[PDB]
Every structure is written in structure tokens, then in C-alpha cells.
Nucleic acid binder design. Structure first.
Ligand SMILES: [Zn+2]
Ligand SMILES: [Zn+2]
Ligand SMILES: [Zn+2]
Ligand SMILES: [Zn+2]
Lengths: 195, 193, 196, 190
DNA sequence: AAACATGTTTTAAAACATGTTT
DNA sequence: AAACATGTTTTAAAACATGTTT
């Protein structure tokens, strides 16, 4: 299984979330001290990238899901069959109906499965912020609930976003848990009460 | 052309269907069948004069709400592809309704309408029995995402001539769920308005 | 492969049967003919009646071998649970291997045997014709574990396979019956009977 | 010698044991009902600190005189089974085990053949009034080949580094499958 | 024999988790 | 949001099966 350890690296690589409009019906929200994303299915979810020094030539940003619990860590993470086949969300998408993670607003995006591992992940060419901007924003879409039967089956997962050299050398990586449910607002308020 | 009829039609042979926290339960006041997935469901047929020759009994599911009637009712992709319940089995894996205990049961998909149903040759009751019994199995829960997506359905059991002329028809709503007992009681209190 | 359990009267019309089952409510054993099943308390002696219609050959023998009833289990040898196999109780000064489920009492020629390849255990007795004026040759069997013995039969039904054989193990006849070794043969039998 | 004593002896340090489902304890019957292998928390209390290498020993013994002389051990089934015996520092025969303490040491008396398990005594955590010991019982009371439904008593003893007894408390233990049911049973029985 | 004892299974009820409707 | 809907899990109670005690 692939690494899931925070490694800031040569470019002080960092992922973070802009304000989580606590406005009850927020499409997604983020608990900082839980290191957890609460996102509704398919809704676009902006992620912030910051680097302390410019990265290599044609560096890239990969996003890969993986289960949290040790017992499942071995098993790939993809969309449950119901979702993989159903008409919704698939319409005319440049992404394979199996991949749980999609990037929005980037035709340079490119999805991928590893012949060997057969693990699914989406890559995007790193691109520095615009003038007077501190972050590079990447738009993500998560295509199944963390409760789809025939998929995550209510089995927690976490996203492993990593920065890499055009040829796969790991320049940095960060990780957060992701529960994609119907009420991120409520499921977060509650999670913050279990303690 | 139009969506299959759902009006009761006793017909010339006075065709009627009836039912005897168990595997299922039937509310007569709501004409609705509550039952667990894949479990066996006994349905009682009754006629008052023997039906014709190759007379058959066909069961076909169809959505209850007008908003959905035009969509064929089938199993969700999950269940249709799963190994579970489809191992040794002659029912095409997509068919919602199956019949167990009858080797003559034949599944059919309309070449034009694409509708799926399962027929059984009609046979009179056993000697001293008043009912011909048919054993039905329902292969998806009503809530199956990718399938019925909790849209209510009606079962349309129809007595037909060897060549598909309808001789009788009875209907009832079917709610395939995990706790027929609970859910039925729910609907019952719901009207306790 | 798993040994055969089909009745085979054979050339000598070999048959097995049981005398009165004395019901008594507290009988040490009882046999249901309609279920071909023997109900009997552990260790208590169990008389079985053999009958032939023509004398068997020379060193002809009678072998009794237990085997699981259900296909799911047929391949597992039937032996005593570890508790009983190690206990002093019953193994006191016995000539019989402490692991063997079936024993025969009252016969010094009885010989226990474990198949070197199959590992199956059985007990043989040299065949002897009935006493003068008697129609049956009687064999006294003892069953050393209750059916429910954890670590052993674990409530898996068994069948007893009594077989008439040639001095060199060629089978001449075979009869079978289910055996339920329990604490209240009376109760349990009545149970199975009401059950149907 | 004679069979180990079972009389309560608070001793100089006012040694006492008590209890805070997987188990339940009846105070009126001084009897512990609990499932096999499931963890059982027991609360020790002293009023003055025990000596140096002071230890807490737990030893099972039959309750009825008819049986007191027989060592209490695991039935052959459980003693040989792989189940509960895989990676274990406890000898597979010992009825009583302690979980969560690497210093726990099992012992068999060379002469009496009795088995028990000791744990070095340690004062409660700061702001806690009880030292807690986690006990596991590895056979049901009914185990054929073992306890064969003969009731037992647990004898938890506070001892000096060299086995001089400083305090002793006792309680009956019934290891079964439904502590709840069985306890209610004994309660109605009276 | 009848009543009990006691581990297992079956059934029933609540409680959860989480998506939808009002 | 608040209430509901609905499959899963947890807990509780009965019912079994079967050996022991009275
Ligand atoms: Zn899905
Ligand atoms: Zn389905
Ligand atoms: Zn045994
Ligand atoms: Zn044991």
C-alpha cells in the first residue's frame, strides 16, 4: 500500500481548505482538528495548495483515495457498481465511471489506474497561483457516499494528495479523512460531540 | 401500446388472488404486500370455473406513480451483478420477480416494451384444496439505489390464455423491505391521523 | 474414499437387529425401527443381534465402525473427544485404545484397529454361530462418548457400520443404523418421534 | 499442609476488593457472574501502603468441601485448543489469567500443584482511589473434564515479596454464558 | 419422571447511521 | 432544519437441546 505520511518536502507543500461556510446547508465543510472533510457527493469541493518554493519542471498533483482502517487498507477504492453504471453523473464525462475522485475545471486533468496495483487516482499539472494570490486551487468531486453499499460500505477513507515530479518522484504529500455524506453539516456537528 | 393496466378484472373465471415478525405480511385494507428480499412469498390463486388450455399466470412489476409508470422495473445493478442469489439459477439476474418451486416457470422480456415478467402454467388446486399456490421471490429491496430507488411498485398478476389474451387480472402494491412488520405498522399508524 | 453405508445382506443373508427396547422411561438404551436409529447412554452396554442364513467362511469377522452421517462430515474419523480420551474414567484398565469410540465387552478376542492410511478406527470380533437353540449371535457394544461431546462428535450424528468380513477383510455383508449416544435415550427418542 | 484459607482478612493495610453485560457482581451473594475469556475488572483498595515487593495473587479453589482438595484448572478441551492459546504468556492450563500487565507471573506450586497468577502491587493512579486488576477466566464453570459445574471461589491475596499473606478477600465465581440470566435465577431462587 | 441447569440458536426490539421529504 | 425513512447492528428475550439433580 501507498504512503500516507505527512511529508512537506523541499517545497513546504501544503493542502488546506478555505472557509467552510458553517451555513448549516454547506455543500462541504472541514474540521481542522479532526483532519476530516465532510462533503456531499459530486458537489464541487475546492482544495488549497501552497508551496514555499516553486516546484520542478512539469510537476504534478495526484489525488488518491484509500481506506483508513487497517483491515481494509489493502482494497482499492472506487465507485460502487450502482453509481458506476447509473446514468447520473456519467452523462458525458472525460473520467472513468469507476474513479471515486474527479477534478473539475481542468481539461489537463488525467485519470489513472496502475497496471500493477490497479489503484485509482487523478493527476493535474501543478500551476502556481495567480498574481497576488497565495494558493493554487484544485477543484475536486467525490463520486460515491462513504456509505454506498457495494463500495466504501460506510468504511472510512482518506485522501492522499501528493505533489510529484513529472516522472513520479514524491516531492511532498498531505492527508485528510474524507466522509462524503448527505449532511456534512450534521455529520460534523455530531462528530464533534462524540468528544 | 400504453402502460400495462392495473385495474382488477375478475373475468369469466372469477380470478382472484389472496394471502394466507414473519418473512412477510399483507395488509388487506391497503392491498399492500410487505416482504423481505429473496425470501419466499406464497400467493393464493382462486378461480370459479376452470381456465382454458395452456392458461398461464403471469406476474409483472410496474411502478405505482404516474411519474414512473413508463420505466421498466428491474433489479438494481448491484444485485444484478452480484454472485449472491444468482449462482445456480435460471432466472435472468435482472428480473425483479422470480418464482421458486416450479420448473415450468418461464421468464420473458418483451421484445418491444422491454418489460419483464414471469409466467407459470396454470394448474388447478390439489384435490381438496381450494387454492392454487404460486411461490414468488422478489429480488431487490424497494429502496435499492440504482433500481427501484424507493419508488413504490404494484404487482400485476394476470390470468392469460395460452396466447396471451388476458382472462383476469388482480393487483396489489408491493413493498420489499427489511422489516415488513415495522413498516406495515408504520403505514397503519400513519393513517391513524 | 469414504466407506460405504448401504445395506448389503450378502451371500449369508447378514442382518442386525435389537431385542426388546424395554421402554421403562429409564432404559439404558432403546432402538427405533422406523428411524433405524439407536438411542443409548454413554459407556452402558449395548446388545446387538446378528443373524445369518448360511455359515460365513473361516476366519469370518464382525467389524463395527462409526462414521459421520452428514456429507459435510463423512471425511472426519469418528473418535473420542480429548476429555474422555485422557480421563482416567473408563480408561482404568482397558484393553481398548482410549481414543476409540466403539468398544466391545465380554470378548477377549476383540481387536481394535486403526487403518494405517485412512486412520479410521473400528473394532472387530471373530464371528461365532449362535449358542445351540439360539437364533442370534450376540455382540455387546459400548459407546464411549456422548454425541454432544465437545471436542469430539460435537453433536454431529453418526452411523454405525457393522460389517461381516472374510478373514482377510473382504466384505460379505453390511448393515447400518444411526446411533445417538445421549443421556436420556427415552426422552430423546420420543422427541424424534413427536418431531415427525 | 491444608487447603488454602478462604476467610476474609483485611489485614494491617485494610485490604479490600470490590466491583464497579459481559459480567455482573452480586454483593449480597458475594458472587461474580461472568463470561469466559471476557475481561473482568476488579478493584483493590488499601488504607496504608503495602510493603516492598508486595503482590496481589489470585487463586481459584473449589467451594464445596467435597472438592477443595482438587486443583482448579482448565478442562482438557480448552487447554489443548488453539483458541485463546495462540500468543499467550499464560500456561494454557491456568484458569485465571490477567490481561494488560506484562509483569503478571503465573505459578504452579511444586508441592501442592496449585496454580495462581500474581501481579506486583501498585498504588492507584493519582486521584484514583482504586488499584485495578484485569482478570480473565478461561473455562466455563460447566466445562466437562474440568470444573464440571462445581462452584469455585476466587482467593485474591495481598502478599509480601516473599509470600507472607498480608490480606485476603474471597468471592464465589460463576463463569457462564449468560451472567445476567443466571444471576437473576439465583436471586429469585431465594 | 419431572424439574432443573446451562450453552446455543431463534426471534424480537431498540438503537444506529444516514439518506430524503416536509 | 426537523422529521422521517430504511438497512444494519446491538441488545434482550425466548425457545431449544440436552445433561443433572430431586
Ligand atoms: Zn456509490
Ligand atoms: Zn437491488
Ligand atoms: Zn467424549
Ligand atoms: Zn473448559
Amino acid at each position: 500500500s501507498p504512503s500516507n505520511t505527512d511529508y512537506p518536502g523541499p517545497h513546504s507543500f501544503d493542502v488546506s481548505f478555505q472557509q467552510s461556510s458553517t451555513a448549516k446547508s454547506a455543500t462541504w465543510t472541514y474540521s481542522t482538528e479532526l483532519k476530516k472533510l465532510y462533503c456531499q457527493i459530486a458537489k464541487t469541493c475546492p482544495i488549497q495548495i501552497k508551496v514555499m518554493t516553486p516546484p520542478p519542471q512539469g510537476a504534478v498533483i495526484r489525488a488518491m483515495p484509500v481506506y483508513k482502517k487497517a483491515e481494509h487498507v489493502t482494497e482499492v477504492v472506487k465507485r460502487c457498481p450502482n453509481h458506476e453504471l447509473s446514468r447520473e453523473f456519467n452523462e458525458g464525462q472525460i473520467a472513468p465511471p469507476s474513479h471515486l475522485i474527479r477534478v473539475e475545471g481542468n481539461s489537463h486533468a488525467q485519470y489513472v489506474e496502475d497496471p500493477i496495483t490497479g489503484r485509482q487516482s487523478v493527476l493535474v499539472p501543478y500551476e502556481p497561483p495567480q498574481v497576488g494570490t497565495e494558493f493554487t486551487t484544485v477543484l475536486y468531486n467525490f463520486m460515491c457516499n462513504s456509505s454506498c453499499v457495494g463500495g466504501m460500505n460506510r468504511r472510512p477513507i482518506l485522501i492522499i494528495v501528493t505533489l510529484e515530479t513529472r516522472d513520479g518522484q514524491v516531492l511532498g504529500r498531505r492527508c485528510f479523512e474524507a466522509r462524503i455524506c448527505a449532511c456534512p453539516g450534521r455529520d460534523r456537528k455530531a462528530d464533534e460531540d462524540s468528544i
